[PDB]
Ligand binder design. Sequence first.
Ligand SMILES: O=C(O)C(=O)c1ccccc1
Length: 304
Amino acid sequence: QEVTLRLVSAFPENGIYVQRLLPWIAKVNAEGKGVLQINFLGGPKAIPTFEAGNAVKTGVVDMAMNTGAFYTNVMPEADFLKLTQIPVAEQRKNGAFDAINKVWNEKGNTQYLARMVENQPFHIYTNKKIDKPDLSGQKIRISPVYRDFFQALNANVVTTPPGEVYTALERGVVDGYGWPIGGIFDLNWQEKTKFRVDPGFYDAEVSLTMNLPAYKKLTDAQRNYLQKQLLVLEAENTFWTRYGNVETARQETAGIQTIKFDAATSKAFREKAYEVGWAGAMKQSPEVAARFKTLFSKAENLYF
Ligand SMILES: O=C(O)C(=O)c1ccccc1
C-alpha cells in the first residue's frame, strides 16, 4: 500500500533545477512513509535528455523533471508552455492548467503534475557583440525553445542538450546559446560567455510529469498526498524572483556585458519572439495552439 515512483531528471544533476528538486523529494519521502515515495534515478546519464519524455509516455519510468522543449518527439505541443504569460498558480484557476493536462493526457499519455520553474525569461548569450536585434553570421546553440525566434533573427542554429553546451563553447562550435537568465554558472558556462542580450523573452517551463496509467493507478490517498506536495513545490516558485535578480548581478560581476536596445526596439524584439513563437505553434497544432493562446494571457495584462 506504499507506492514507490521512479523519477528521472532530463537536466544535469549539478544544475539549479535538480538542486531544487532533491530537497522536495526528501520531504515527499519523509512525510509519505506507508503511502508514497519517490526514487530519484538521476539525470541524463540514467535516460538521455531528449528521451525522458518518451520514457514517461511509455512508463519506462513513472515521473520526470523536464521541459516540454525536450519532448517534442512525443508531441509538438510539448514546447508550447514557453508561451505562458501567467504563473502556474493563475493557470490552475483560469483553465490553462486543465487544458494543458488534457492535451498531455491525450497526445502524450502523460499527466501534467506541476510547474517548478517560471519567472525565468530566456535570453540570447553570445561571445560576438551586436548592436542590432540580428544574429546574422552567428552560430547559436538551441533547443526547440529558441528555434523559430533565433531563425527569424537569422542565426545558424545547432541543437544540443544542456550537458553539451560547455563543450560546444570551448571548441568554438558555437558563438553563443539560448538559456534562461538563471543557471549559466552551474556548468561553468560563464567562462565562455561575454554578453547577454536583453530583454528576456518567453518563460522557462520546467515541470513534473507522470505516466498517465501510473497516475490513474494511484489510490485516492496516494494521489491526494502527491497533490498536496506538488502544491508545496509550486508555492516556492517565489524563489525564481530573487534568483533572477541575483544571477543577473552575478553575471555583471563576472564580467559579462549586457547588450541593451532602446525602448521601442526592445518592445519589438519581444513582440517578434511571441509573434513567431505562436506562428510556429499554430503551424504544428492549430487547434491546441489557439486554445492555449487564449488561456495563456489575462485580458487586463494584454496591453502591458
Ligand atoms: O535551453 C534549453 O535547453 C531549454 O530548452 C530550457 C528549458 C527550460 C529551462 C532551461 C532550459
